[PDB]
Design a protein around this ligand. Structure first.
Ligand SMILES: Oc1ccc(/C=C/c2cc(O)cc(O)c2)cc1
Ligand SMILES: Oc1ccc(/C=C/c2cc(O)cc(O)c2)cc1
Lengths: 387, 387
């Protein structure tokens, strides 16, 4: 009796990305002049050596601009947020418990419009953020804000960190594939109000986050068994993995404290990622008989430019493999979990725009990686779609 | 090519609970004398009317004792934790980022011993808590503490609230069923260091949490396709749902602030649960042709005794249906997400102890419910196992 129920309940084909929409706070913050702004707004003009280090960090970041909910007016009204370490969680939380779902809604509406089907057909909702927590969560807020059915099955992923663009895909794959008819709205939405803080010369690692983190949200519709010529596949998920790199304890830490979310880098993250990326690639692609990593399309979380440079160096990737990744890092900075989903959007849009054969830059197979605390690597093996 | 991969990758039978282990902080806190202790340790002896209200709340709670990490010594060393609203998140976080995984490890070791198979066969790990957050999370800590493989696939569920015993089961079902060979360790671990606070006479709702919340962890092993006579099924999952009750906005709220995790009750939760439980039951059991709710075995989150009493009243359940639920509420109080998993353990152990025909009190089908913020109801339809 349960065998028959199980058989009828499950989907049949691979989880597929059917729509992608993104959104960012309207405030565009130029990187070239950020050092000057940031040292002024934090009342840190007298830390001249630290300022010169930050200017160097920003000039090497390979980020031209970021979008930030935080403005000069907001920062003036919250001096504790501008100090390196002052009680400020309540103020930050008040900002992000609202802005995370507001921004996620904007991205989600775009994805739902692209999908083109009734929102009442969304059966599952995954919401992911590293900024702020609340009860009921941002998943409940987004259900109310979008008018989803009350029986949407929710997955609230909080405080995950940068690898979680990969995690939401690994999660969505199983929800979609094990449930016939399931249609999963996936929303990653990240806002740096929780991480922004002033500079301190004995905390240079913290300072790196101030050069790299940006705001944004991305939404997907994921489903198996797409209805031919109603729904339009963009990418198919085939296999996923998550692992912890050896010898990386405490490489990236982040505590949610009375002074907001801190950020620490205690180890060489670019070196750890680069030393462990081959292992991740042969786990994923050796069963498919592929060993040429220039023959697949690439999406990599751009935690900072050095991760990308060292990966490309280690593997001998052609410089163009990381073009889609670098273009997102350039125009939006590191948006934690959302980043990789902006990169999928950029790649399929550019592939379509340029008349390539597939959504994966003309190639059949591809890989998406998330990197973050642990040190954690998430791997998602993708197959592109024709046209 | 992907069709063949998909076909080979998925499991075939229903997700099954193969082992359950639980654990609690060693400190046993008697309810009869709690009012006296709590008003003294919080320096609230002069709030005589409030004290009499709390004594009534504890005497009606139907809780005989709870286990708490917090002790008199710890409370003396943290006066801010004893005030109704004082900066104390950092201190609370320091307690629970350690104790959540420590306690989860204790429960997990018990479940793994019962399961009897190598821990290297755990492929997925779900960790769930409403107390504290950190990066890397309690899932990373539990992977290190237990010596799981580094490539265990982790699901960190933070700040979820009381319905999440149901949520981890809904999640584990899809992971197990869509992945051949998958074996999911599920750990809910809850510690009231984050919620404990002193009493305030204009915040009586908050005070209810102080009479009801307790500490504990529960762990499960979940898998499809149990290996005959190596692995031993206890309960099978068949169907799941999550929904938001109408007219319940703001019924239960909880914010993670500089003063720790607050708790508010703005609506009649027992009444909302009772008015919406029938709908949840016919969604679940009308497709199975069952309408007699005394004919199934019951597991219900015991948020407080009034929820149970009003459910039993609304449906005309025989008083014995809630025996397993009430026994856990009596001996451990409300342990948020872990509660329902302690109740499954109690029911299968008592059914086995008393020589009943099935693990579900001698009955074939059963239901598990979680209730929490939203107002959210999680439903899990279960099938028992013979013997
Ligand atoms: O908009 C956002 C963009 C990026 C971030 C990053 C936060 C973060 C904080 C850490 O301690 C660890 C880290 O791995 C990630 C948060 C918000
Ligand atoms: O050990 C524990 C036992 C219970 C709890 C409950 C916390 C909680 C706080 C709220 O604001 C909302 C609520 O629904 C749940 C936390 C720890």
């Amino acid at each position: 009796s349960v065998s028959e129920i199980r058989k009828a309940q499950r989907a049949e084909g691979p989880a597929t990305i059917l729509a992608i929409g993104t959104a960012n706070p309207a405030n565009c913050v130029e990187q070239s002049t950020y050092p000057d702004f940031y040292f002024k707004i934090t009342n840190s003009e007298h830390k001249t050596e630290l300022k010169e280090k930050f200017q160097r960090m920003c000039d090497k970041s390979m980020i031209k601009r970021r979008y930030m909910y935080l403005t000069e007016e907001i920062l003036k009204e919250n001096p504790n947020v501008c100090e390196y370490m002052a009680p400020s969680l309540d103020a930050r939380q008040d900002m992000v418990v609202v802005e995370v779902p507001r921004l996620g809604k904007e991205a989600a509406v775009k994805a739902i419009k692209e999908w083109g089907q009734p929102k009442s057909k969304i059966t599952h909702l995954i919401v992911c953020t590293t900024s702020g927590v609340d009860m009921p969560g941002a998943d409940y807020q987004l259900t109310k804000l979008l008018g989803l059915r009350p029986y949407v099955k929710r997955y609230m992923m909080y405080q995950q960190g940068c690898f979680a663009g990969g995690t939401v895909l690994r999660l969505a794959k199983d929800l979609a594939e094990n449930n016939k008819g399931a249609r999963v709205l996936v929303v990653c939405s990240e806002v740096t109000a929780v991480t922004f803080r002033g500079p301190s010369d004995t905390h240079l690692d913290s300072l790196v986050g101030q050069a790299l983190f940006g705001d944004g949200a991305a939404a997907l519709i994921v489903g198996s068994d797409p209805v031919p010529e109603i729904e339009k596949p963009i990418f198919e998920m085939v296999w996923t993995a998550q692992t912890i790199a050896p010898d990386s304890e405490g490489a990236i830490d982040g505590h949610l404290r009375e002074a907001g979310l801190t950020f620490h880098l205690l180890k060489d993250v670019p070196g750890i990622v680069s030393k462990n990326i081959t292992k991740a690639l042969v786990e994923a692609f050796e069963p498919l008989g592929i060993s040429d990593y220039n023959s697949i399309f690439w999406i990599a979380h751009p935690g900072g430019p050095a991760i990308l440079d060292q990966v490309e160096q280690k593997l001998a990737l052609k410089p163009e493999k990381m073009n889609a990744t670098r273009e997102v890092l350039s125009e939006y900075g590191n948006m934690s979990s959302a980043c990789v989903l902006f990169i999928l959007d950029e790649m399929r849009k550019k592939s379509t725009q340029n008349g390539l054969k597939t959504t994966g830059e003309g190639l059949e197979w591809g890989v998406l990686f998330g990197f973050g605390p642990g040190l954690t690597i998430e791997t998602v093996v993708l197959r592109s779609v024709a046209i």
